[PDB]
């Protein structure tokens, strides 16, 4: 009973999103957008039934593609550890409402999958044909992220220094950097938020998202028509459902009964940065 007040105080702050994002794998350098996506996946959306008997998915699906050495398995392990229910496979029934991480991609479960390039390493010039999965299975994923080995002389030095500092200082002290939440506390907070309530969208946000979806569909049209080639990542109503689910998850993170326009804007920005860059 006492922990309810603690969770309410934690979720009533104006900076819950930043604290949660920083709490997602503080050891890993960079990937703030990836950390936020992982956090909103862990919070997840809300499922809704229909009187006709039909059900709509309330879980988010993410896919990651990149060269080896981009710390993909570490994120999967951290997600499995943090999630109240978590399964890790090398490539479903026992998981109910949890998260299933799937490495080497080449029942109410959220799916987080990692995969490698067809040729082993990404080729920027070739563009498409670097993903072997068919568009039919690619459409199920709510978001797709691409990671490339951005070779910078200063970035390698910074990464080496960060790794060596993590190696050295870890026996000395194990303390939060800046207000980071403990693993058990974050686990209980996520469970409490998931159990307590689930929000719904608003009319103005719905109209804004509809207009943005129409504009994005026209843009994907024009890109495909000018390129004279079929995009391996199509845009359909499932993308709109994914954006709605991400906005609902963002509203759920604040425990508000109704979603705001800021959540929809953040969901649209994340969806753009992931899919449009990937596509």
């Amino acid at each position: 009973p006492q922990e309810e007040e603690e969770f309410r105080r934690l979720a009533a702050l104006p900076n819950v999103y930043e604290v949660i994002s920083k709490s997602i794998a503080p050891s890993i350098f960079g990937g703030t957008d990836m950390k936020k996506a992982i956090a909103c996946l862990l919070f997840g959306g809300s499922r809704k039934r229909l009187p006709d008997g039909l059900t709509r998915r309330g879980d988010i699906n993410l896919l990651m593609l990149g060269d080896p050495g981009t710390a993909k398995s570490q994120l999967l392990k951290f997600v499995e550890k943090c999630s109240p229910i978590g399964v890790y496979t090398s490539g479903m029934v026992l998981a109910d409402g949890g998260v299933v991480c799937i490495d080497e991609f080449d029942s109410r479960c959220s799916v987080l999958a990692a995969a490698n390039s067809v040729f082993g390493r990404w080729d920027e010039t070739k563009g498409e044909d670097n993903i072997d999965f068919m568009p039919t299975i690619l459409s199920r994923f709510d978001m797709i992220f691409i990671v490339k080995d951005e070779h910078n002389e200063e970035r390698d030095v910074m990464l080496a220094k960060h790794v060596i500092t993590l190696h050295v200082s870890a026996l000395t002290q194990t303390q939060a950097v800046e207000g980071e939440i403990d693993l058990a506390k974050l686990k209980k907070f996520i469970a409490y938020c998931r159990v307590k309530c689930g929000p719904r969208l608003s009319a103005e946000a719905a109209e804004k998202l509809k207009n943005r979806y129409i504009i994005m569909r026209s843009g994907a049209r024009q890109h495909e028509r000018d390129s004279d080639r079929r995009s391996s990542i199509p845009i359909t109503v499932r993308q709109l459902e994914a954006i709605v689910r991400i906005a609902e998850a963002l509203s759920k993170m604040k425990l508000q009964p109704f979603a705001t326009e800021a959540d929809v804007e953040e969901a649209l920005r994340l969806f753009q940065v992931s899919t449009l860059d990937a596509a």
């Binding site: 068919m134 568009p135 039919t136 459409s139 509809k210 129409i214 569909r217 049209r221 359909t236």
Partner: protein, 303 residues
Amino acid sequence: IAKIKKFSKTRSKDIFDQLAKSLAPSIHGHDYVKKAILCLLLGGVERDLENGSHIRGDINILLIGDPSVAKSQLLRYVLCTAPRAIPTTGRGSSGVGLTAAVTTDQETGERRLEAGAMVLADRGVVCIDEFDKMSDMDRTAIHEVMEQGRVTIAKAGIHARLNARCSVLAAANPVYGRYDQYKTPMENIGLQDSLLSRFDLLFIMLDQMDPEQDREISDHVLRMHRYRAPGEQDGDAMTQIYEKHDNLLHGTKKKKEKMVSAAFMKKYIHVAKIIKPVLTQESATYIAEEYSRLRSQDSMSSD
């Protein structure tokens, strides 16, 4: 009865036009598919001969196209409307499920027959989604039903023949996932000649993203989504021949035309299925000449 007679007499030639139009308001376009579904609902005529030979009176239609062209929606609508409609997915039911089997009863030691999926659906509709995922062997099993509508079973100590006069809807995806415009339809379909020949109609649906078509589809989907059933409070968690006009379901432009109600449509379909037509001599020569033209079109197929 009086209303049916009045509608038939007033709308003489428009019936087949209206029923196809009002078949599925929730689905936009695909007039030919709606006409084919209407023809399936009406059905053909089964003819029995003095020699006892049986001629099939059912029609088989196969739909192939890109994803998200409202094919499963049509299958579900047919399942809801048809009196005896059975859905059987590709790998959900095998040949044992589709074809009646023989089981040895331990209580008495005799062998009994248990009806399959198609045996129960006599003079009905069988819907098969993901027909591509079905194995070739179930296709061979279904071939007998599609040819003569009968299943012959013989296991030592017992033999029988069961009637399987039924119509089949089939929905399948292309081998490449999306239909290839450049490649020939033979490569895209990827099916044997016998199976295609046994099918009566083949429909190919393309997700042509035309400006006006995309705008119209989006408008129809938005209008259907924003619609709410009357008599119900907003935000709550949860017979005339012509349907009452709705500003959202129909639209302001569609005020000039009305859709037929579901119950009246079902009654008219049943009455029409009762009716037994007779072919005329004038149409026979025209049909024969057009068939000869179709067969000779091999030299006139152009590109």
